[PDB]
Subunit: 345 residues, 4 copies
């Protein structure tokens, strides 16, 4: 009845399979999927041992989703069949203190209630159709290209969230360091330019990726190696960086972040790569804050899409078919994706 | 001993005159003036009746000052002879709650203590030399061109201050309206682009000035006439503008601001033009805030200069000599200055 | 089938009448009403000429509602029959930028969509039963006394909102002025003590009401008369008040607010009493902001109720029956209610 | 010429000694010391090995200072002989971006320029007289008791700073945990009550100290032991604490802080006790921030003193003479000081 990309066996690769076409229950909506982004978080999930994997098998992947509204569940109002929409991913209960400010990413009853994001417990977007639990998890696209913008649902939303949180500690004329210019990173750079006055130093491990970072707005680019810290120190007059966004989050990138963050600065550990930053006296500088944020808010998604509309941010897309999804994931693990891999089913 | 531009007779024009070269008292510094901006606030001061004028005669004009440090007063440390510096203008006591956060513009003991800005009570910058009361009112220029950047001391500082105050009410994807694209206005536009994601609508009364506004970053430009409000309504989907910066502040521009500010929006009345905005229920929308800010903070000046360094903002300058200062002021009143008039003595 | 208090004829008084007991449509919930507060906003609505009145006749009054969940509409989840809940009143669309941060009070599509608060267009709480449009407009009471706390839905929520907005301009050791110690006012005073370090000056026109204000936390109380401004000036060392909350909002109380707000201060015009504050240069001080807020946010309601739980705030209640509702409204207009009139049907 | 308490030999105890009475150089002021607080930071400094100790020998101790102005240095204005003043301790350059907002605690040129706080490099307050570098490091006392309030210069200032930084993450009705109810801790508790709506859970290791914490405003007190985490979990409905202030900062107290901080919460590591908090994914919860703040700002000091004036905070003082300073330090290390040890010379 419909085609989809699923994780089905622990330690195995994602596979294109045929599954039932779902029907919207009451409250729910079905989208005909127009675009679906691939995220390195998916590689992280599939790289988990059986004892640590909690999302059930099979799992349709894909938590960056956009589409056209296909069918309405019982009692649904707010959207009409035919509306083009992006999917807000980090679902929450809707009612707690956090959910009420739109910050369903920090919902305090989601684990207890078994609420799970699409592609991370609930059925994802890498399919011809998908279900969304509730109308508040849908944002209008207007006449934004779904393929061009779908990744703003995470590749944009997540670093935007990290940046907005950090703005107090990034005055104009301060310096922001971005470690990793990939899916999130290449959007992170653009977002720092759009809404701060900060000088942006990007880092990565291919010249080719550094060149894209330069073009996307990075004032300075640097290889992520042993020299990085000292060059960043030189670039900031020895003061260090007011803000550091680590989009890798390995021990070594975190170590780098610790050596270059300024007095009173902030480190957002965005990338999930196995490290921790030892925060405390004589480890991190005085006044320096460290945080590992997760995804972002409903308002923030809308805001990121509005930046797309205004031409202030865009995704560098590498386009694929549904059948190529496995192939594309292999490319992503190998580091041969330029920007974001996006599937059009 | 030195040449200067002064206001000497009520209702009269500024004149080039010869005066004593001042010597720095203890705490004070003398600058050899490298650049001096002209502001429409000066026209406002000289247009005051005798009973309302409080700055004493004669008065050397010019509150946008930059220079090279010429001589040190007794006990001065912090600066060296030869340092290039911008002058922070809205002087305060240094010690009250406001002064301590750097916001000497909102100093609560300045009037009581007779503290007055250079060119607005104290001797100004339109001269070959000038005195600054204290070292904390000097900011380093580095290798910024004094002539290009001097006006960032007010033409930049003032609207930057207004914008920073308003950022909470300007999410990315909201709309900011700028009424008046003159000295402050043409910098205001650039600053909104540098540090917000907001769509900028500029307004003015010459096509020529609107064209410069477009080039400087305004997404949309509009003649400031009877149609303005409805076009702004159309441009925002009928919601109105999240923020309005009125750099004219006449009753009519204020009236315009009131008709277009959105629910929960903000109006910064920056221009001094004789009006007031009737703020209250069924006059201003629910949640809408109105403010008449003054100048800006010490940190904000530094921040604006750092934006100049990073190429994010600049002043469109029209250059003059000291002898042409009167001529230049006539031009400013007539509306035939492109950006900012700057004198080099 | 059920008893209710309605406004039925323009210029007439509210009447106890018998109406149909409503049934919950899909999405909706019915409450058995445990308490219903009376607000002076209701007097304002009933005092409107026919051409300005937009809520339709008849209208069941009462926008401060609490209850026990009586029946669930089709497809409703989140609440169970038997749950004790407060009603969040300033309803919005749920989906716009403002609604998504919980600030349905500043919803930008409510007027267009005909969305109306209970007791202010939709059927209110002064009845044995009431309908709520959606589950997100219900907050749990836990084991808070509905009668004691119901007025926190507006009498608390509204000034809390005004205070939270103003906190940046109320450092500890600054002074907050509260003009009017009535339903909102007597809670406003308590809230300023709970969550700021500000010295509180309350004002009113009866000694008896001033005495309650003193007891509820006001550091200083003053008759609202010609001497008020100078006493407030003396009390602040001539600086003025960092924040002023006018809970009357008549021209004279607004005039008072203008004369006493400090440089860089803020005025929240909370009371609806026909005035406007002329905001602008030489009318309001430099940096002073003026705002007419409306109600508050979803998070703020929860926060106010949590303060009640912690014993940090309470409502001084004057208790009535449904039959006494008209009588109680007469008392409120005459100024002989101590704190808040609350009806228990 | 004058008596003072100094650290003179590595690993040795502080001694009362006779030294020259200092004279104010230009810019400087001499205080006749009216009170001098003892801080556990001093124990930390004296417990340092020779290779890690950087403050030179001898060193007059005492960084909580208050006094009466005794003599003016050359060119000093702002203060008069006879003015009662508290000493702002975390000195900075005065001119950098941080210093300009008053945050000399986060000055980015202090280490480079050898600027050192009184009692932590510069000569301290535990003496009959002391020198202050500049007038901006003095705050007026008014008619506050120097002995009662002197410790607000650090015991108050430091946690106030930590709390103010955390307020965004402490809505009213959230929970704040304070680990350690000593000099800073017992003020921290009061400050959380004064300026937030948060429920306060204090912890310590003596019943006697816990009892004082209860009296000073702690809603709940708990022994700092193996049960602490679970009781805190029970007390917050399993959500955890929105904010945790660790005033011990040992590995075990930091471990406790990590287990109880909520999703989106914040940990301020205030105490210097040798630990670090491993901040990062699956170590700290999503959105949780960790920071090790240092001292506070100029505005914050003023604000804390203004809270004292208003009766909102006070120091529980244990009074000593200069000769008893060594004895008092022994007591502090042994944990037999109730609140703050204060010396009156
Ligand atoms: N916190 C969140 O909510 C959240 C959300 C989405 C993704 N993520 C995480 O963010 C990280 C990045 O995701 P993505 O989709 O952008 O990955 P990606 O594969 O698109 O990009 C990774 C980039 O990191 C670069 N890189 C690798 N090692 C590096 C090093 N030592 N120094 C500098 N650069 C280095 C690569 O060259 C590449 O450009 C992942 O760990 C992912 O799980 C986190
Ligand atoms: N608040 C403060 O602290 C502060 C500081 C500096 C200047 N100002 C004030 O700001 C205002 C502008 O100063 P400036 O130096 O930029 O003046 P300017 O002469 O450089 O520019 C004025 C601009 O306003 C435009 N204008 C005039 N009427 C208009 C209308 N009805 N609609 C749209 N545009 C209109 C003109 O065409 C011109 O471009 C003045 O009133 C000045 O006194 C205030
Ligand atoms: N902005 C909003 O969203 C919102 C919400 C609710 C109520 N309100 C408005 O707030 C105002 C107060 O409502 P309430 O229910 O507390 O009224 P109330 O009748 O309970 O209290 C009014 C109080 O104001 C006092 N007062 C009257 N004139 C005064 C003066 N000149 N100076 C000082 N005190 C004076 C009275 O003595 C009384 O104590 C009303 O205008 C109401 O419509 C606004
Ligand atoms: N970050 C800063 O800028 C700054 C400033 C001043 C002081 N400090 C540091 O703050 C800490 C406290 O200073 P103080 O003067 O208040 O010390 P103090 O001696 O006055 O108080 C210490 C308190 O901690 C309690 N305590 C010890 N171990 C504990 C545990 N495991 N659990 C709970 N409570 C415990 C003690 O019983 C005592 O009440 C020190 O480490 C000091 O160096 C930091
Ligand atoms: Zn992802
Ligand atoms: Zn939730
Ligand atoms: Zn000016
Ligand atoms: Zn001042
Ligand atoms: Zn009301
Ligand atoms: Zn809405
Ligand atoms: Zn200390
Ligand atoms: Zn500094």
């Amino acid at each position: 009845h419909m085609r989809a990309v699923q994780y089905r066996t622990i330690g195995g690769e994602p596979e294109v399979v045929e599954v039932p076409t779902p029907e919207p229950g009451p409250g729910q909506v079905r989208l005909r999927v127009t675009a679906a982004g691939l995220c390195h978080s998916d590689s992280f999930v599939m790289g988990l041992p059986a004892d640590q994997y909690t999302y059930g098998l099979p799992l349709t992947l894909g938590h960056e989703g956009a589409g056209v509204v296909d069918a309405l569940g019982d009692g649904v109002t707010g959207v009409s069949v035919g509306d083009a929409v992006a999917v807000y991913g980090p679902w929450g209960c809707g009612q707690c203190h956090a959910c009420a400010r739109g910050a369903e990413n920090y919902c305090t009853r989601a684990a207890e209630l078994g609420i799970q994001p699409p592609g991370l417990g609930s059925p994802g977007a890498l399919a011809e159709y998908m279900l969304v639990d509730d109308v508040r998890h849908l944002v209008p696209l207007g006449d934004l290209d779904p393929v061009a913008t779908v990744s703003l649902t995470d590749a944009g939303l997540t670093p935007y969230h990290a940046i907005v949180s950090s703005l107090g500690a990034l005055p104009p004329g301060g310096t922001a360091v971005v470690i990793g210019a990939g899916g999130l990173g290449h959007v992170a750079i653009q977002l720092l330019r759009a809404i701060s006055g900060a000088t942006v130093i990007a880092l990565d491990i291919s010249d080719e990726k550094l060149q894209l970072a330069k073009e996307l707005g990075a004032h300075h680019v640097l290889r992520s190696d042993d020299d990085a810290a000292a060059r960043i120190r030189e670039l900031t007059g020895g003061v260090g960086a007011a803000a550091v966004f680590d989009i890798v989050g390995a021990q070594a990138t975190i170590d780098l972040a610790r050596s270059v963050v300024a007095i009173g600065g902030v480190v957002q550990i965005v990338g999930i790569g196995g490290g921790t930053l030892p925060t405390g006296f004589f480890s991190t500088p005085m006044g320096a804050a460290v945080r590992a944020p997760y995804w972002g808010t409903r308002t923030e998604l809308m805001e990121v899409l509005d930046l797309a509309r205004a031409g202030a941010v865009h995704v560098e897309v590498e386009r694929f078919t549904l059948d190529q999804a496995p192939e594309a994931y292999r490319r992503l693990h190998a580091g041969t994706i330029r920007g974001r891999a996006v599937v059009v089913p």
